[PDB]
Design an enzyme around this catalytic site. Structure first.
Site, PDB file in Angstrom:
ATOM      1  N   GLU A 170       0.925  -0.870  -0.258  1.00  0.00           N
ATOM      2  CA  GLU A 170      -0.029   0.043   0.033  1.00  0.00           C
ATOM      3  C   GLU A 170       0.877   1.082  -0.212  1.00  0.00           C
ATOM      4  OE1 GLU A 170      -0.015   2.276   2.092  1.00  0.00           O
ATOM      5  OE2 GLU A 170      -2.230   3.164   0.354  1.00  0.00           O
ATOM      6  N   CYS A 218      -5.822  -0.982   4.893  1.00  0.00           N
ATOM      7  CA  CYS A 218      -6.222  -1.172   7.383  1.00  0.00           C
ATOM      8  C   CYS A 218      -7.501  -0.527   7.134  1.00  0.00           C
ATOM      9  CB  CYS A 218      -5.363  -1.188   7.889  1.00  0.00           C
ATOM     10  SG  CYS A 218      -4.448   0.842   7.526  1.00  0.00           S
ATOM     11  N   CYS A 275      -0.257   5.000   5.989  1.00  0.00           N
ATOM     12  CA  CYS A 275       0.253   4.571   7.225  1.00  0.00           C
ATOM     13  C   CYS A 275       0.996   4.774   7.768  1.00  0.00           C
ATOM     14  CB  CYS A 275      -0.473   2.576   7.246  1.00  0.00           C
ATOM     15  SG  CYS A 275      -1.978   2.154   8.047  1.00  0.00           S
ATOM     16  N   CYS A 278      -6.232   5.155   5.862  1.00  0.00           N
ATOM     17  CA  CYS A 278      -5.568   3.771   4.848  1.00  0.00           C
ATOM     18  C   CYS A 278      -7.307   3.131   4.319  1.00  0.00           C
ATOM     19  CB  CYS A 278      -4.830   2.798   5.768  1.00  0.00           C
ATOM     20  SG  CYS A 278      -4.278   1.715   4.499  1.00  0.00           S
ATOM     21  N   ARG A 331      -0.875  -5.131  10.585  1.00  0.00           N
ATOM     22  CA  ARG A 331       0.726  -4.136  10.279  1.00  0.00           C
ATOM     23  C   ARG A 331       1.037  -4.524  11.916  1.00  0.00           C
ATOM     24  NH1 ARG A 331      -2.733  -3.926   6.153  1.00  0.00           N
ATOM     25  NH2 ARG A 331      -1.838  -4.602   4.467  1.00  0.00           N
ATOM     26  N   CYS A 371       2.754  -0.669   5.175  1.00  0.00           N
ATOM     27  CA  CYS A 371       1.520   0.551   4.102  1.00  0.00           C
ATOM     28  C   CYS A 371       2.076   1.862   4.386  1.00  0.00           C
ATOM     29  CB  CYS A 371       0.429  -0.282   4.940  1.00  0.00           C
ATOM     30  SG  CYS A 371      -1.306   1.303   4.702  1.00  0.00           S
ATOM     31  N   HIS A 419      -7.995   3.119  11.483  1.00  0.00           N
ATOM     32  CA  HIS A 419      -7.541   4.003  12.564  1.00  0.00           C
ATOM     33  C   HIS A 419      -8.669   4.945  12.815  1.00  0.00           C
ATOM     34  CE1 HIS A 419      -3.369   3.708  11.391  1.00  0.00           C
ATOM     35  NE2 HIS A 419      -4.133   4.271   9.875  1.00  0.00           N
ATOM     36  N   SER A 476       3.510   0.128  10.383  1.00  0.00           N
ATOM     37  CA  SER A 476       4.762   0.974  10.160  1.00  0.00           C
ATOM     38  C   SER A 476       5.609   1.451   9.801  1.00  0.00           C
ATOM     39  CB  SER A 476       4.088   0.269   7.873  1.00  0.00           C
ATOM     40  OG  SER A 476       3.391   0.142   8.284  1.00  0.00           O
TER      41      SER A 476
HETATM   42  N1  FCO Z   1      -2.135  -2.283   9.823  1.00  0.00           N
HETATM   43  C1  FCO Z   1      -2.470  -1.482   9.228  1.00  0.00           C
HETATM   44 FE1  FCO Z   1      -2.082  -0.055   8.913  1.00  0.00          FE
HETATM   45  C2  FCO Z   1      -0.786   0.088   8.935  1.00  0.00           C
HETATM   46  N2  FCO Z   1       0.900   0.375   9.252  1.00  0.00           N
HETATM   47  C3  FCO Z   1      -2.227   0.453  10.481  1.00  0.00           C
HETATM   48  O1  FCO Z   1      -2.328   1.154  10.841  1.00  0.00           O
HETATM   49 NI    NI Z   2      -2.484   0.774   5.690  1.00  0.00          NI
END
Ligand code: FCO
Ligand code: NI
Ligand code: SF4
Ligand code: SF4
Ligand code: SF4
Ligand code: SF4
Ligand code: FCO
Ligand code: F3S
Ligand code: F3S
Ligand SMILES: [Mg+2]
Ligand SMILES: [Mg+2]
Ligand SMILES: [Mg+2]
Ligand SMILES: [Mg+2]
Ligand code: NI
Lengths: 268, 551, 551, 268
Positions: free
Chosen positions: B13, B63, B548, B60, B478, B545, B67, B501
């Protein structure tokens, strides 16, 4: 037989617009890429990376000059000479402008590319703008939503392929089959609105009877879309209001990401 | 020796650049760079705390959900709100079903083409391929006839001259080790995976109102109206529909994804000996089941210097030891303030000055835990669960090891899990255990509604004066995610997201220490520096990601 | 002789009683009796012609759609309305998709348990079962692993002691000839068939507004609003959704249903030599494609004394020879007027006087064509297509015969199609050819809309004086259907439905001649007169619908 | 584990109510009969016929006395001493009354058994009546519609199984989750009704814009049901009005099969 080529470039995207394709059923994403189109460039799915994938892009831009559909998700950041999105060392706005030159059709998928969306909200830290703003001499087809139902995009592409031209568009270049009407002018809770039957808080009696969500902040009265009819995910009965939450106006510039969830909409 | 750049890294991502110095055919030093920033922390500032989740969910869309959930938990933390248990069950089902989709797509659509050669699959004997899986899988779609249909789809794509997403792949690369038959097996499963992940997201959609980007949360609980006898709301018919999709996920996860994880390990056993990113690991507990934001189904903790036996458990999202340890630095990132910052006092002031090997080279910040670099994500979460003596995790890992043993005659020890393949294994184990989370939480919801509890939402009050700090933790696909909200005079005065990430992809830190991506790459053999497949193999194992990482 | 009664005959639609006299273990004489009547013809009388279709559709919910379509066709006939071509395409897609569902369910859910022994399936070796299908089918769900999962479902059901729909079945009956492995194959396909028929009905629902009982017709066309660019109407997105389900039907039909038809025939070859019901056969052409209610994709005709070479083609639903030949008698039915009646002059006056072997014994009337008994349905429609030299039909039959020949070493001659198994074969051939009807008509609709034709409905006018007559023909899953409407002073003054199961199941007629069900049973061996499975085998091959037969 | 037993008897049925089960997805019909319930008697699906299936009925009526759910589709004809529906030589009303004696719960699935439906319309040739009319001493749960969405039935059965009692019922003994509201009080075309935006004939401009179908005879204003929300077949967007045809009132006694398609409804 040969399939119509598509070039997909992400700018300041969250990837949710690509991810919408993974919920699609007509076509599914696997039938899209094997049967409906040739997806000549898409960084999320491409086997090739780095120099090899930029090789694919340039080969495709030349081989399919004048023939490919260009798709962009995310806003395009113009502040500080484009450095807030750099791919292969160069501003994304440059990649998009180059690809736009030979495009047969150009689609802004999602509110970010269609009108700036969340990435352009508030103080707009990166000077994010829409695809149409970056391509002033081109007709950009806008498919807004955060993200739209993927078939708002897929049926637009299908209309291009099958009938040789875009679907009919409104004055914001949005396909009328998906954006031609206010949500509130085709919402199954309008009877409750009309009768003054309103949820006042999540979990209250009216909410638990499926009443209108206007007084929770529903933006249906000022948002064009097909969320109440086409809905989402093709399972039946699934859109924000049907689940119990007001529309936030994510399709519509100046509504989503600008007004608070519980801020009341103006009614026409 | 020489310098290479991989830009864009695909099948992640977002926007990532990886640079490597190669000396004597091996990576000697690497740089990870997030090349796109939006300023989402600044966009959400100055708003009502209740609005944040709808905005920051857009960090994101891969994912998605995560959030949104972390944001409401952060406001609930600041405001001292206990979430109704039915809202926890619903939030938990969403997170577990989302994560199932996420991990499946990662293994297949994002990662498999690092290990699988579609050209070689054209040479496979479909009957031999099916025979290889006897006593390894009971999956009902491994027949020669299935594999022949898939092989013919590849054949037709190649014949068309339009390879699209498969064009200029690393076919015939010397690091591609699968026999034709196993390449064909993997492509068949790649396509089958798309159906399973679709079913997972039908679960998410029925509670979230759609996906990507759910719309059923609130500071104070959820917007789903529970009423078994109500028209147009979350009734018994809708719950039965949710259950029908939950039940469709297990067979593919257990009989295809779990098995393929062992198969890849069996053919690539050297990848159990490279790709170590860190010696410290962090995860938070997840899936709360009580009325006070606790009693988690999955445990959390902190492992230091790879010592499972002396790890520190984390059982609460209010743990002050966890909270006080977390800081981020921007010394090698394109922001102005460089000293380590606790997120409640964090700033995000852009200061782009171009790429410098020794200066700033990324939009990702550098997180530390009490001054140390830490790996987060499925490897961390598995190792913590093993340290906790969680039998379900031990047993699931042992199932993967048993397939590996049947295929190779060799076993797998925990030391080999600190690796590229161990990281992939941790993700598979997580996806498997999440199926029991789904069954458990669906049953808990039905049971609780049957006791007469239909409550879903506690309306918040937000004092118009005073300064209040909250943090929302979540164990995302993640790794550990945290959102840090400061409220002052009724509005958000600071918002800082520290995303998994960020921990893994962040650049060299205030003390110039190397984070997980950059560390994991040291020692990577690169047969062809123009086509550095081996580097992308290890980087993909962290499931980057970058929307992220940077936000 | 011995006298038996089979009451109720199950695994049909509706209420049927079959009586047989048995001499030395062979049926010598039979009686078919429809035991339930509603008077649907009287219920619809004296109403606006436009309302009839919604009422008479409820003659049957198995063959839903069919009476609705025949009713609008009858009113359009009376009123002289030419249906818009788009309305024909839509009507045609509905009928073809419905019939796909109908035939699949008939072969599996209604008929297979006459031929398949679930107890024997428990003894099967699933790997041997899968091997038997190599080079006979390319279906992707014939693996040992699939068959083992199915076997275990049966095992668990039996072990529970609650056999439900399987309780007291004819397990171990001497006429059950399949080996364990083929029993297990058939049960696995029985379950898989339920997914395929569900997809067929998703096509129907998207155009009909629901199924059972579609709601998109009108005297004058259809209620679907065609607008590629319209929100909430039949636009390109909705058409793409329809197509996605059309495309899902072919593989099961061609690789499972068609193959199992040949397999059953291969193991039951004596059933090619009994169950002949008639020497005359009738079908009507179907799937009109012009703007004047004609240009049918499937041909119709009349075969006398089994002579295909001299058959009479029928190419028009206005064919006066067809119309003038149809009469019904109630001599041996529970109605008052016994002499043969043309349907426009028909009466339906109940006169129940109990059962009499030589008097009245059924609520079904006795139809004749120019005084002869006639079999209708898929055997008739296949033989007419063969007589017309339709290559698609000959080719499809040849594919079934090729599989049968691979398994037995023998071919099938047309003479052998006048039989219980030939009747089943004609139904399978129909289902296979209907998949091409679906592709053809979907493509025709897309093309025509692209030319700018979005018309769907011609509003009727109904004169308020005068008397006029119409007839609507339709080739239904069970054979030729006709609805006969007389309008007088603007309302329905007579309504008579002559339904395919009426032709086949009707009792002895005005001349005491024996109709298809009763004739087909003469000569049936009955090994155990308490459990006359052999009689039900032949009766089920006609796909009885007694709500249809009696209405 | 043992599964709850169900006995299903068809009277003057068209089989459409059973057929609804073949469209169901939660549960599918195969999961219904293998996992959810034990279907101890159903003539459409049972392997046994004739004397063997009647043995199954009598065995189940004994083994499961006080435990089974009895389901009836179709009307019950009383004229001429019950002879318009005879099974195994006896009037169906006698089979139904016998099975009703030992039932734990009794369900009339479809308008025919719920209130007589189409079979009792017009001159009512057979003196057809509802299940409740033949069982005056019993609480018959009515699940009307022609046929209902199968989950209106399946979720009712699930409530009896899972929580031990019927779902909440209205004063016609219909489950409120499915029949608690008029279709017109939860219809997505209500905004068009409110604005006077009406289709006048099929195929006209308003019809092709998805406008309200009141003036085509829509019976939504006088029919209770969930057709606009739950819809049909679980594909999304599929119910009569959404397809372009008015509601006919098939759920509702005195509306469906009595009023003409194009006759106008009374609006409260
Ligand atoms: N899983 C995911 Fe996105 C990332 N790194 C978030 O929190
Ligand atoms: Ni993400
Ligand atoms: S429109 Fe929404 S889903 Fe699409 S890129 Fe923007 S934030 Fe993501
Ligand atoms: S305010 Fe929202 S919920 Fe209420 S009728 Fe309008 S769009 Fe529907
Ligand atoms: S309610 Fe309708 S579908 Fe059910 S039996 Fe009666 S006519 Fe048939
Ligand atoms: S009349 Fe019918 S279409 Fe119009 S708003 Fe009412 S229920 Fe909906
Ligand atoms: N097919 C069907 Fe029904 C019968 N017989 C009708 O028409
Ligand atoms: S928030 Fe967006 S998805 Fe539809 S319901 Fe409102 S426009
Ligand atoms: S006719 Fe019946 S199915 Fe619903 S839309 Fe009206 S109640
Ligand atoms: Mg409260
Ligand atoms: Mg941050
Ligand atoms: Mg002749
Ligand atoms: Mg008749
Ligand atoms: Ni029928």
């Amino acid at each position: 037989p040969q399939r119509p080529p598509v070039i997909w470039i992400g700018a300041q995207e969250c990837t949710g617009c690509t991810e919408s394709l993974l919920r699609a059923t007509h076509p599914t994403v696997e039938n899209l890429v094997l049967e409906t189109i040739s997806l000549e460039y898409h960084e999320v799915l491409s086997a090739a990376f780095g120099h090899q994938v930029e090789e694919n892009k340039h080969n495709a831009l030349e081989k399919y000059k004048g023939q490919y559909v260009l798709v962009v998700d995310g806003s395009i950041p113009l502040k500080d000479n484009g450095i807030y999105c750099m791919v292969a060392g160069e501003p994304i706005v440059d990649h998009i402008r180059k690809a736009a030159e030979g495009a047969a059709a150009i689609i802004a998928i999602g509110s970010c590319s269609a009108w700036g969306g969340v990435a352009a909200a508030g103080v707009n830290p990166t000077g994010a703008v829409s695809l149409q703003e970056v391509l002033p001499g081109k007709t950009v087809i806008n498919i807004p939503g955060c993200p739209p139902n993927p078939h708002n995009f897929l049926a637009t592409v299908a209309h291009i392929i099958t009938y040789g031209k875009p679907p009919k568009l409104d004055d914001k270049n949005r396909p009328t089959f998906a954006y031609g009407r206010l949500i509130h002018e085709h919402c199954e809770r309008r009877p409750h609105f009309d009768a003054g039957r309103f949820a006042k808080e999540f979990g209250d009696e009216g909410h638990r009877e499926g009443w209108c969500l206007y007084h929770l902040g529903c933006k249906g009265p000022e948002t064009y879309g097909n969320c109440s009819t086409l809905q989402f995910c093709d399972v039946g009965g699934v859109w924000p209001v049907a689940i119990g939450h007001p529309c936030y106006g994510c399709n519509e510039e100046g509504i989503g990401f600008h007004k608070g969830i519980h801020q009341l909409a103006n009614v026409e | 020796s020489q310098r290479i750049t991989i830009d864009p890294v695909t099948r992640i991502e977002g926007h990532l650049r990886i640079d490597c110095e190669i000396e004597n055919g091996v990576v000697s030093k690497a740089w990870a760079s997030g090349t796109m920033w939006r300023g989402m922390e600044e966009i959400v500032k100055n708003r009502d705390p209740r609005d944040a989740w709808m905005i920051v969910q857009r960090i994101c869309g891969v994912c998605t959900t995560t959030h949104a959930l972390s944001s409401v938990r952060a406001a609930e933390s600041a405001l001292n709100i206990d979430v109704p248990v039915n809202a926890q069950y619903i939030r938990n089902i969403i997170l577990a079903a989302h994560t199932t989709h996420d991990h499946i797509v990662h293994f297949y659509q994002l990662s498999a083409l690092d290990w699988v050669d579609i050209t070689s699959a054209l040479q496979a004997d479909p009957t031999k391929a099916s025979e290889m899986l006897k006593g390894v899988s009971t999956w009902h779609l491994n027949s020669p006839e299935e594999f022949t249909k898939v092989q013919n789809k590849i054949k037709d794509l190649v014949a068309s001259g339009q390879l699209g997403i498969f064009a200029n792949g690393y076919w015939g690369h010397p690091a591609m080790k699968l026999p034709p038959e196993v390449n064909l097996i993997a492509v068949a499963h790649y396509l089958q995976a798309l159906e399973c992940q679709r079913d997972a997201n039908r679960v998410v959609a029925l509670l979230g109102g759609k996906t990507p980007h759910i719309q059923n949360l609130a500071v104070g609980g959820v917007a789903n109206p529970i009423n078994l006898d109500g028209l147009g709301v979350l009734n018994l018919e809708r719950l039965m529909y949710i259950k029908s999709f939950i039940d469709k996920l297990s067979d593919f996860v257990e009989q295809v994804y779990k098995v393929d994880t062992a198969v890849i390990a069996a053919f690539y056993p050297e990848w159990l000996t490279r790709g170590k990113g860190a010696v410290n690991y962090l995860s938070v507990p997840e899936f709360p089941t009580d009325s006070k934001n606790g009693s988690f189904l999955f445990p959390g903790g902190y492992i230091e210097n790879a010592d499972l036996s002396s790890y520190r458990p984390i059982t609460s999202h209010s743990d002050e030891y966890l909270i006080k340890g977390i800081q981020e630095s921007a010394k090698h990132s394109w922001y102005k303030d460089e000293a380590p910052q606790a997120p409640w006092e964090g700033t995000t002031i852009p200061a782009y000055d171009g790429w410098s090997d020794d200066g700033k080279y990324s939009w990702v910040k550098s997180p530390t835990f009490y001054g140390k670099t830490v790996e987060v994500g499925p490897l961390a979460n598995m190792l913590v669960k093993l340290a906790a003596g969680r039998e379900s995790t031990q047993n699931k890992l042992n199932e993967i090891v048993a397939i590996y043993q049947k295929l190779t005659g060799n076993t797998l020890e925990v030391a080999q899990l600190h690796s590229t393949l161990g990281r992939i294994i941790g993700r598979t184990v997580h996806c498997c255990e999440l199926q029991d989370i789904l069954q458990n939480q669906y049953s808990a919801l039905i049971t609780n509604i049957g006791k007469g509890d239909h409550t879903t939402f506690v309306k918040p009050n937000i004092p118009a004066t005073g300064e209040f700090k909250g943090v929302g933790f979540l164990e995302a696909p993640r790794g550990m995610l945290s959102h840090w909200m400061v409220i002052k005079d009724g509005i958000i005065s600071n918002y800082q997201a520290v995303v998994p990430s960020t921990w893994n992809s962040g650049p060299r830190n205030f003390n110039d220490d190397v984070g997980p991506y950059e560390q994991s790459l040291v020692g990577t053999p690169v047969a062809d520096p123009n086509k550095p497949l081996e580097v992308v193999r290890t980087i993909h194992s962290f499931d980057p990601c970058m929307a992220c990482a940077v936000h």
